[PDB]
Amino acid sequence: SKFSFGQATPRTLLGIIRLSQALAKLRLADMVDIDDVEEALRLVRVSKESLYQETNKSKEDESPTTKIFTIIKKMLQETGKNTLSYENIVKTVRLRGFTMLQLSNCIQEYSYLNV
Amino acid sequence: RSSILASANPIGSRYNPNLPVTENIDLPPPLLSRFDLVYLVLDKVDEKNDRELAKHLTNLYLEDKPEHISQDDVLPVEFLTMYISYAKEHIHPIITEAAKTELVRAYVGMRKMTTRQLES
């Protein structure tokens, strides 16, 4: 890419350890917690993200039909059949938290396009 | 009369796999043939290698003494120096007829794929 930085050298791994150990000295603690590792890794990501702009977009809250489609992919991974009789997928949707009325509308929608 | 143990480095600090060894390093061709062992330690990105290497370096900083390693597995520095100085003043290996026959056959097969490699 255009923002080709340096290679992941083993010296960069020891730098996070030295930054995490120095953060514990300011808090007067003899043990490094999880907060010291996340704070040391944040300073490295900031210096590396100085070239990119401040435009970040993220969206992942669509219809719940996509979550039900992930359960169908689990059955195709173990078997791989597109039959109409589905008696094991209904037992997995009930354990999640979805209703049985919305499940029948999702199976009929996918069966029309043969998925 | 002493051995030379150096470590070379590429020009752009990155050994490109699509470039010859003579073009990546600015060393003279006669200087490369004078050496005996030209090791090429690369920094390959591997998930199975970086995981085990980080655990080995972390164990050295946790405990000052390797308690997990037995005493019969790591020799001290005082005993290692006494094993080299003793063998370099009394042990003198002699090349026999069976050992000299395999050295000639190995030198011919390497050229079919300089005299400095024979003495190494």
From Swiss-Prot, chain A:
ATP 2 binds at residue 11. It comes from the Eukaryota. It is found in: Cytoplasm; Nucleus. Component of the MCM2-7 complex. The complex forms a toroidal hexameric ring with the proposed subunit order MCM2-MCM6-MCM4-MCM7-MCM3-MCM5; loaded onto DNA, forms a head-head double hexamer. Interacts with CSM1 and MCM10. Present with 166 molecules/cell in log phase SD medium. Early fractionation of eukaryotic MCM proteins yielded a variety of dimeric, trimeric and tetrameric complexes with unclear biological significance. Specifically a MCM467 subcomplex is shown to have in vitro helicase activity which is inhibited by the MCM2 subunit. The MCM2-7 hexamer is the proposed physiological active complex. Belongs to the MCM family. Acts as a component of the MCM2-7 complex (MCM complex) which is the putative replicative helicase essential for 'once per cell cycle' DNA replication initiation and elongation in eukaryotic cells. Core component of CDC45-MCM-GINS (CMG) helicase, the molecular machine that unwinds template DNA during replication, and around which the replisome is built. This is DNA replication licensing factor MCM7. It comes from Saccharomyces cerevisiae (strain ATCC 204508 / S288c). The chain holds residues 677 to 791 of 845 of the full protein.
